Amino acid sequence: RHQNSEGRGQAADLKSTQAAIDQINGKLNRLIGKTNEKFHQIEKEFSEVE
Amino acid sequence: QVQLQESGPGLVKPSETLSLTCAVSGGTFSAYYWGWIRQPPGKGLEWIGSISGGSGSTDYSPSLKSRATISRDTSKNQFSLKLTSVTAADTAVYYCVRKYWGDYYANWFDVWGPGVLVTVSSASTKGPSVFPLAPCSRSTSESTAALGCLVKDYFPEPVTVSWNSGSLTSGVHTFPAVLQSSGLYSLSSVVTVPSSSLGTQTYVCNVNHKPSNTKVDKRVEIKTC
Amino acid sequence: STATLCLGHHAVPNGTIVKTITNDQIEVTNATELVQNSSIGEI
Ligand SMILES: *[C@@H]1O[C@H](CO)[C@@H](O[C@@H]2O[C@H](CO)[C@@H](O)[C@H](O)[C@H]2NC(C)=O)[C@H](O)[C@H]1NC(C)=O
Ligand SMILES: *[C@@H]1O[C@H](CO)[C@@H](O)[C@H](O)[C@H]1NC(C)=O
């Protein structure tokens, strides 16, 4: 936000904000879609107590 | 990391220009300074001068300041020395070296060139004379035999001999070059091979007179008068 | 004229990638290993 003689205006940046969002987007991906597969567990509920 | 390859003619006519080049491998030429250094065999060595490997701003030893002219190239990753009005004494081995960026600092000559011999061509350049030398009874130890290969009549120096193209290395001794009364240069590269192999294998001494581009895989064989 | 002092840090012609939390890939001077993956091959 500037305040000049001409008036009062704003202008957005793209350079820094692109690097901002970029680093956030990675952090998503490093924590999103990443998974482990588990194919045969042991039972986790017990109807009877042996 | 950083390696250098020294290049140039090891021979040059008296009172003529010397032109040498050395290579860089790894690093960026723009990011250091480079100098040259002179050493005749078995005496004191000397710093020649340095240049801005980045910009081209230079210095030279006062003695060789007028005589020596060093250069660079950003393009080819190379750099040159041009020396005018050479002396007969100037015959030496040369080096390319990495110097620190600071005009005044320590840790100079951190890395050195492989070393290229530069001999002034006092006499006419010529081909090597490869002289085989047969092992005898009087040149064989109990465990070893003395096969020889003399490179005589060769001008100029050096001459580097390979044995079986460097297949055998054990007890291979390149005897230093000799100034004979002939005014001509010569040497043998003696090979010690076990006495058990005598009269069996016909060994080869291989001549690499690099400036003359000569290859002589000449054998050594026994002959009777 | 007028003098200029100018600060900075060293680098290496050849470096290695390293996984962080800030950036999944980055180049630093000198790396090492934390996982011995190789054996002599005998007890
Ligand atoms: C980079 O740092 C390592 C630190 O590990 C240095 O490596 C030394 O040598 C061996 C094999 O690399 C390691 O097992 C040791 O941990 C290190 N020595 C000690 C006792 O500290 C290495 O010197 C460095 N490399 C360079 C040239 O910067
Ligand atoms: C570093 O080493 C790698 C692998 O040899 C090579 O591909 C790369 O070009 C080298 N980089 C520099 C700056 O030497």
Going from the C-alpha of C24 to that of each of B22, B125, C21, C28, C33, the distances in angstroms are: 40, 63, 6, 13, 17
Within chain B, strands assigned E span 6-7, 11-12, 18-22, 33-39, 46-51, 58-60, 68-70, 79-83, 92-99, 111-112, 116-120, 129-133, 145-154, 160-163, 172-174, 178-179, 185-193, 204-209, 214-219
Q: Neighbouring chains of B at 3+ CB pairs within 8 Å?
A: C
Q: Distance between CA atoms of B154 and B163, rounded to whole angstroms?
A: 19
Report the distance separating Cα B189 and Cα B151, nearest Å.
8
User: ω before B156 within 30° of 0 (cis)?
Assistant: yes
CA distance B81 to B117: 15
As a dihedral over the C-alpha atoms of residue B106, residue B111, residue B114, residue B118, rounded to 10 degrees, the angle is: -30
> Can you read off the two tokens belonging to residue B178?
């000799």
Contact B151, B190 (CB under 8 A): no
Q: What is the DSSP track for B91-147? A: -EEEEEEEE-SSSS-S--S-EE---EEEEE--S-----EEEEE---GGGB-SS-EEE
Nearest-CA neighbor of B128 among B97, B152, B107? B152
Q: Judge contact between C25 and C19, C-beta under 8 A.
A: yes
Q: How far is CA B46 from CA A8, B61, B116, in A?
A: 70, 9, 15
Q: Is C30 near ligand 1, meaning CB less than 6 Å away?
A: yes
Q: How many CA atoms lie within 13 A of A42 on its CB side?
A: 1
Cα–Cα distances in angstroms (integers) from residue B210 to residues B132, B184, C12, C27, in the given order: 20, 18, 36, 44
Residue nearest atom 11 of ligand 2, based on CA coordinates: C14
CB distance C22 to ligand 1 below 6 Å: no
CB C4 near ligand 1, within 6 Å: no
Report yes or no: B48 and B60 within 8 Å, Cβ to Cβ.
yes
Per the document, the length of chain C is: 43
CB contact under 8 A, A23 and C23: yes
Cβ atoms < 10 Å from Cβ of B224: 3
> Any bridge partners for residue B18, and if so which?
B83
Cβ neighbors of C13 (< 8 A, separation 6 or more) are B1, B2, B26, B27, B28
Interatomic CA distance for residues B155 and B123, integer angstroms: 7
Breaks (C-N over 2.5 A) in chain B follow: none
Distance CA B138, CA B145 (A): 9
Measured CA to CA, the distance from residue B155 to residue B11 in angstroms comes to 9
CA distance C13 to chain B (A): 5
Residue A3 token pair: 């305040």
Q: Distance between CA atoms of B73 and B51, rounded to whole angstroms?
A: 11
How far CA A16 is from CA of A9, A19, A22, A30, B144, in Å, comes to: 20, 5, 10, 22, 77
| Closest atom of ligand 1 relative to the C32 alpha carbon | 5
Q: Please name which of B156, B176, B162, B146 lies closest in space to residue B207, comparing C-alpha atoms.
A: B162
List the beta bridge partners of residue B162.
B206
Pocket of ligand 2 (CB under 6 A): B 26; C 13-14
Resolution in angstroms comes to 4.7
Q: What is the DSSP string of B134-150?
A: ---GGGB-SS-EEEEEE
User: Which approach determined this entry?
Assistant: cryo-EM
Question: How many CA within 13 A on the CB side of residue B202?
Answer: 7
State the sign of the Cα–Cα–Cα–Cα dihedral B55, B56, B61, B62. Answer: negative
Check C24 against A23: CB less than 8 A apart: no
- Residues B167-198 as b/e (b if ≥16 CB within 10 A, e otherwise) read eeeeebeeeebeeeeeeebbbbbbbbbeeeeb
Tokens found for residue C6: 């100018």
- Are B40 and B157 a contacting pair, CB within 8 Å? no
Chain C CB contacts of B26 under 8 Å are: 13-14
Residues of chain A with Cβ-Cβ distance to C22 below 8 Å are 23
Ligand 2 atom index nearest CA of B26: 14
Residue ranges of chain C whose CB lies within 8 Å of a chain B CB: 13-14
Q: Which ligand is nearest to the CA of C15?
A: 2
Question: Residue B208's closest CA among B131, B127, B132?
Answer: B127
C38 lines ligand 1 (CB under 6 A): no
| Residue owning the nearest CA to atom 23 of ligand 1 | C30
